Each structure stands twice: as structure tokens, then as C-alpha cells.
């Protein structure tokens, strides 16, 4: 499970 | 420039009627084509050049993942299937170096160097930094030590800035801190690092929502809640 | 062409792989490089150059219709905004009308006229046809008629072939008769024609289930049930 | 509401 980065 | 022809305000038109289409690749060509006229961008064309990039490294990186599994399935009784895994893998990630080195190319050439107030230079330095993270995402070699330190330095600088210039809940400040925590924990084998930085941003943002209209109270949450969401997976 | 010096199983070997990564645009560079090798192509290779054209064209036209809507909109009380929206929408435009164009080129040198085998042929024929259907959405001026003529005839050789070599559950022919019966609702102004093609294939295709394995049956039952949808939303 | 065509 990836982490979570900021969207757009 | 096949952009050069093109007034800017048709192109930022243009990018917003890309957006619609999801037509993301024309919208960085657009973009670009906006940055290039040499004036600096607003907060909502700023906007756009990120959700146009983000958009078209998001799907590179997407499947530049899906083909480094299997290639890396094939290297484990694998039977040898010749060299096309790796070269189409190559093909991917060359293709999303080539467009990070255009974001980079963009930002140095001149966006940070004319930001001056500490929305747009916090933007920019984020930026590159991110971009600087999918680079060192296929890095392997000789360079990924100094790709990494470049995204480091790059976070490092728009954090030093964030927290003297803008409120902790300031949503730019909230995304960098965000990302630069992925960076820790992603990139550089730092989780403890990773896990303190969301800690304390989110404390941080909590104790600032009172001071808060509705619809900031709005944007502010969140991206809370990503800093939430990752804490939880982190610990 | 970019791909002659690369092996054609190698090419259907990484059309594969850009399906999985999602890269339809690759996928369809490899298959259209595969077909120029200028070999038959297989039941399993057919299948590819076709997931790969329909994954592009329907990007492109998901495209055109928002930019046609906002075109038409813009064309009530409304405010003037200039040749963009215009100049964009035929952008999109003509970059789909040159994917049907490459398509049609493939199956025209030499796809076709090499496919004696009803699977092949009628496959072949039903793509011509969905290709000038894909034309016919975006035309307008003196070539209108003759687009959708050339996409009915292509249809209605595929459907004669279909109708006298395959049994009513095959699912080339089923898909065949489900995309010209929306050819008549939506191209030919002839909903009638739609809705009694669409009846009359699910008729015959149910009464000849009884001769099918577990897993032909989950075929062809699938595609009966889009025809279902359809009578459901035309009547 | 558009019609559905043949699926891949
Ligand atoms: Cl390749
Ligand atoms: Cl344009
Ligand atoms: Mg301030
Ligand atoms: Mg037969």
C-alpha cells in the first residue's frame, strides 16, 4: 500500500 | 515553441477547456505554452500548470509500476522471455523523465526565480521537489544519491518559507508538508521522519481551524485528513 | 514506419504489456506496427488491434462530445469568447478523424481483402464500419451521406457473411448487429430498424443457447444483455 | 442517454 501524496 | 502563435490568454482557455476533456497532455502543452509568454502566473494558472503535469506523470508513473512488476517477476524459475519487458519499461520511464525534466526545465528557467511572494515560491520550490521525487522513484544509478538530495533541498527551502510566511493551515503549506512527508517515508527510508513531520503538521493545522471561515475550514480538513489517512497506514 | 526494425512477435509481445500499463496509445502503435508486417493476424492479434483503436478513438470522442457541448452552448444570451472553443473542438476532431483514418488505411492495405475466414472477414468488416461511424458522428458537411454510406455497407456485407456462416450466438456476430443497430438509433435516424435488429438478434441468439458449453453461454449472454439495455433505453 | 455499442 502506497502513501497518500497531495491532490489536485 | 508550436505554442509561440498562440495569444496566453487563449492558451490559459484552452488549458481549462483541455481540463474539461481530460485532455491532460494538451493541457501541459498549453500550459507550458502560458509559461513560456515570460510572465509570471496566477494562483489559478499556477493551479492548472500542476493539475496538467500531475495528471500526465500520474498515468506515466502508474504504469512505469505495472511494467517494473513484471519485470521484476520475470527475474525471479521465470521463464526467460527476452529483452521487451525491459525495453518497454525503458520506454516509459524515459518518457517520464523526459517530462519531469521539462517541469524542471520550466521552473528554472524562470518561475522561481520571479516568485517573490511566499504563495508562489512555496508553490514552485513544492513542485520541484515533487518532480525531483518521480525522478528519483526510477533512479538507480550513480545519480539517484544526487536526485534525491535535489528533492530534498528543494522541499526543505518551501518548508523553511511555509513556516514563516504562511498560517499552518494555509492549504500550500498543508500539501508540501504532506509531500515532503511521502518523501521521508517513500524515497528516503526515513519513516520515523516521515511520521513526525504529518504529527505535527496536523497538530498544528487542528489548533490553527478556529481562526477559519467555512469554506477554508473546508480546504484545510482535507488535506488533513491525508495526513490522517497516511499516519494510519505509517503506524 | 517507427516500428519496421522490431520483431512482430515482439511487437504483440509489448501490445500486451501496454494493456496492462494502460498505454493504449503505445498498444496501438505496436498492433498497427504488427499489422504492417504485412502476416494475417489471429483471432487473439485481431482482438488486440481492436481494444487498442477503441481505447483511443473512445478517449477522443469522450473529448468531442464535451467540447461540442460547450461549442453549442456557446452558440444561444450567451457571451462572446472567441474562436477557441471552435478551434479546439476541430483540434480534437481532427486527430480523431486521423485515428479512423489509420484504421480504415489498415484494414483497407491489405486486412481485408486477405480474410476469407468468416471470423475474420466479418471482424474486418463490422471495424470498417465502426470506424466510418466514428466519422459519421463528427461530420457535417458535403460528406455526411457518403460516410454513413460507407459505414452501412460495411456493416450490411459483414451482417450478410455473419448470417450465413456463423450461428446466431457467435459473439462477433452479436457484436456486429448490437454496433449496427446503434449505427440506425444514432447515425441513420432510423430507430425503428434499430429496435427491430435488436430484438430479432436477441430472439435468435436465445433460442440457440441450448448448443452451448458454460463459458460460450457467459459469452454470449453478456453480449444479449447490452442488447437488452438498449431496447430498454430505446423503447 | 447514448446507446451502448459492443464491448472490448
Ligand atoms: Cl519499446
Ligand atoms: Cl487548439
Ligand atoms: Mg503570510
Ligand atoms: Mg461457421
Chains 1, 4 share one sequence.
Not at chain 2, 506515466?60 to 525471479?76: G, Y
Not at chain 2, 487542528?206 to 488535506?223: G, N, P, V
Request: proline share 2%; hydrophobic share 35%; with cysteine.
Amino acid at each position: 500500500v502506497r502513501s497518500l501524496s497531495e491532490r489536485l | 515553441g508550436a505554442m509561440g502563435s498562440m495569444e496566453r490568454a487563449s492558451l490559459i482557455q484552452k488549458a481549462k477547456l483541455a481540463e474539461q476533456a481530460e485532455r491532460y497532455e494538451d493541457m501541459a502543452a498549453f500550459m507550458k505554452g502560458a509559461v513560456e509568454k515570460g510572465e509570471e502566473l496566477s494562483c489559478e494558472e499556477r493551479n492548472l500548470l500542476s493539475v496538467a503535469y500531475k495528471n500526465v506523470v500520474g498515468g506515466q508513473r502508474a504504469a512505469w509500476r505495472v511494467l517494473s512488476s513484471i519485470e521484476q517477476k520475470s527475474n525471479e524459475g521465470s521463464e526467460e522471455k527476452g529483452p521487451e519487458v525491459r525495453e518497454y519499461r525503458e520506454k516509459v520511464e524515459t518518457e517520464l523523465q523526459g517530462v519531469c525534466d521539462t517541469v524542471l526545465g520550466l521552473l528554472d528557467s524562470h518561475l522561481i526565480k520571479e516568485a517573490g511572494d511566499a504563495e508562489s515560491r512555496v508553490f514552485y520550490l513544492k513542485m520541484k521537489g515533487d518532480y525531483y521525487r518521480y525522478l528519483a522513484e526510477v533512479a538507480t544509478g550513480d545519480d539517484k544519491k544526487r536526485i534525491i538530495d535535489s528533492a530534498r533541498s528543494a522541499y526543505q527551502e518551501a518548508m523553511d518559507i511555509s513556516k514563516k510566511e504562511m498560517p499552518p493551515t494555509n492549504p500550500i503549506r498543508l500539501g508540501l508538508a504532506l509531500n515532503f512527508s511521502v518523501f521521508h517515508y517513500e524515497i528516503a527510508n526515513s519513516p520515523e521522519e516521515a511520521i513526525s513531520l504529518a504529527k505535527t503538521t496536523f497538530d498544528e493545522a487542528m489548533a490553527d481551524l478556529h481562526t477559519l471561515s467555512e469554506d477554508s475550514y473546508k480546504d484545510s480538513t482535507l488535506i488533513m485528513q491525508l495526513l490522517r489517512d497516511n499516519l494510519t497506514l505509517w503506524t
